[PDB]
Design a protein around this ligand. Structure first.
Ligand SMILES: O=C(O)Cc1ccc(N2CCCCC2)c(-c2ccccc2)c1
Length: 131
């Protein structure tokens, strides 16, 4: 994951409110979470990848090994079971909870890190730049 490592800042978002609605996030959390401009900090130590999200809304952190499921409390307080893999150079993060599923893909495109969040037919695209 060398080209993912570093400190990234959110610079654009599209369709995120609709993605959060599809996920089941309530009104007040959507409003405050949608305002956030997180920094995403990605690091690797051996086989362990750590992704931190720091913002005025919440500070979260996950550490994981590719292909190995882990339990995650999301920023909107879902208790999910997550599995992250590398598929053709894209980090693919699947979250399962309550019979539901959402997929978050992270990829390098030019000097950006593009984050695509999909729930059923709804996609949100979040673009990060190096900090
Ligand atoms: O990291 C990304 O930008 C993609 C992504 C996906 C889900 C997010 N959650 C879970 C869905 C409800 C809102 C919070 C967030 C998020 C994290 C920190 C502050 C605001 C938003 C970011």
């Amino acid at each position: 994951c060398d080209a993912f490592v570093g400190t990234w800042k959110l610079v654009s978002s599209e369709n995120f409110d609709d993605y959060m609605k599809e996920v089941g996030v309530g009104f007040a959390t959507r409003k405050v979470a949608g305002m956030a401009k997180p920094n995403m900090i990605i690091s690797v130590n051996g086989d362990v990848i750590t992704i931190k999200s720091e913002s005025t809304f919440k500070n979260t952190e996950i550490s994981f090994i590719l292909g190995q499921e882990f339990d995650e409390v999301t920023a909107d307080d879902r208790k999910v079971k997550s599995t992250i893999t590398l598929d053709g150079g894209v980090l693919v993060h699947v979250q399962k909870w309550d019979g539901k599923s959402t997929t978050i893909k992270r990829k390098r495109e030019d000097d950006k890190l593009v984050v695509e969040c999909v729930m059923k037919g709804v996609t949100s695209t979040r673009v990060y730049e190096r900090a």
